[PDB]
């Protein structure tokens, strides 16, 4: 009562017992603390099977295995911004059928020597559809995503893809190779658009972080013997309630072949990977003239 | 890329052999006459 409630943990659900001799709560000691979101839970695990019984959003419809094969990113469904979490006093627009629909980006071909690609969100959809037009016309943007990476192969084909969602996928460079150049990735590399960008070093994910630990991020496998597609339900993950859709990407979708594609000669050599994705609970605010970038 | 801006289904024909694209009734008028090449293309349902 006699102290300012201005610590970094006010508003949390954790009760902290602390020692403070000053006016401010942040001056106090760290003290004591008086399914699981991180394991890429399924829709059945999160109990969201009712919203998943038919993946039809807007005016689009995809078909896949239900519930168990629907990865909800961090166990949280996309939602509109709550009244307390939002800061902008302007009321947002909710098109909800012209922006919350499945958009099909491109048809990148999986090869035996394929290294992998990444797609930045919502950079992939900035110049596509009513969602793209709302992204250019509005300063503020907020949406979840339902990304459905599709890769059909016969039962004689083999291989696996780590279809993963890396939030705030900052791209690093080779720094001239020797590491003493301080180069920075260009706009076509940081924001490659709907066409995506092929990974130069998928082992370090072009950021100095191993792909072996990419599974701590929301992810799903496209092991060809088991499933032919991966559906990841990504919520809006940002330090802010809203953000610009043009100069900040909330997350990068990593589609990397961990197990290489392999088949004997006579089967179809064209094994394409299709990125179909739907914004969920899309919000736009701060309306002005449309700007591409 | 132009086509996905409209009403669309993505159909995994390997897993499900049959899909149904429901063409929704999207019209200015309550009823549509026969769409024809010419003036009566006003009553077009659109393109699939």
């Amino acid at each position: 009562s006699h102290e300012n409630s201005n610590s970094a943990t006010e508003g949390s659900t954790i009760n902290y017992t602390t020692i403070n001799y000053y006016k401010d709560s942040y001056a106090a000691t760290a003290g004591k603390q008086s399914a699981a979101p991180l394991k890429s839970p399924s829709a059945e695990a999160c109990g969201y099977s009712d919203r998943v019984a038919q993946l039809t959003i807007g005016n689009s419809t995809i078909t896949t295995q239900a519930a168990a094969n629907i990865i909800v990113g961090y166990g949280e469904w996309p939602s509109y911004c709550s009244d307390d979490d939002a800061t902008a006093v302007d009321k947002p627009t909710r098109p909800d059928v012209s922006v919350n629909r499945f958009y099909t980006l491109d048809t990148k071909l999986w090869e035996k020597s394929s290294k992998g690609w990444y797609w930045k969100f919502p950079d992939v959809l900035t110049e596509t559809g009513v969602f793209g037009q709302n992204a250019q016309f509005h300063y503020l943007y907020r949406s979840g995503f339902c990304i459905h990476v599709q890769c059909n192969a016969s039962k004689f084909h083999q291989g696996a893809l780590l279809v993963a969602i890396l939030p705030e996928y900052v791209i690093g460079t080779v720094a001239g190779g020797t590491g003493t150049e301080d180069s920075h990735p260009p706009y076509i590399q940081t924001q490659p658009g709907a066409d995506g960008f092929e990974l130069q070093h998928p082992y370090v994910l072009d950021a100095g972080i191993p792909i072996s630990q990419l599974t701590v991020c929301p992810h799903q496998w496209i092991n060809l013997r088991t499933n032919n597609c991966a559906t990841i339900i990504v919520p809006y993950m940002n330090t802010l309630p809203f953000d610009s859709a043009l100069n900040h990407c909330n997350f990068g979708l990593l589609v990397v072949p961990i197990s290489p594609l392999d088949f004997d000669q006579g089967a179809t050599p064209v094994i394409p990977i299709t990125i179909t994705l739907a914004p969920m609970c899309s919000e736009f605010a701060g309306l002005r003239q449309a700007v591409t970038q | 890329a132009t086509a996905m801006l409209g009403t669309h289904v993505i159909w995994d024909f390997g897993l499900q052999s049959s899909v149904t694209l429901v063409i929704p009734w999207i019209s200015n008028t309550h009823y549509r006459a026969h769409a024809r090449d010419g003036v009566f293309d006003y009553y077009t349902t659109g393109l699939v």
Partner: peptide, 16 residues
């Protein structure tokens, strides 16, 4: 119909 697109309530008083 609703398995394909998000629909609005239309009171279809269309005679058969």
């Amino acid at each position: 119909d609703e398995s394909m697109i998000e629909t609005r309530c239309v009171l279809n008083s269309h005679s058969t």
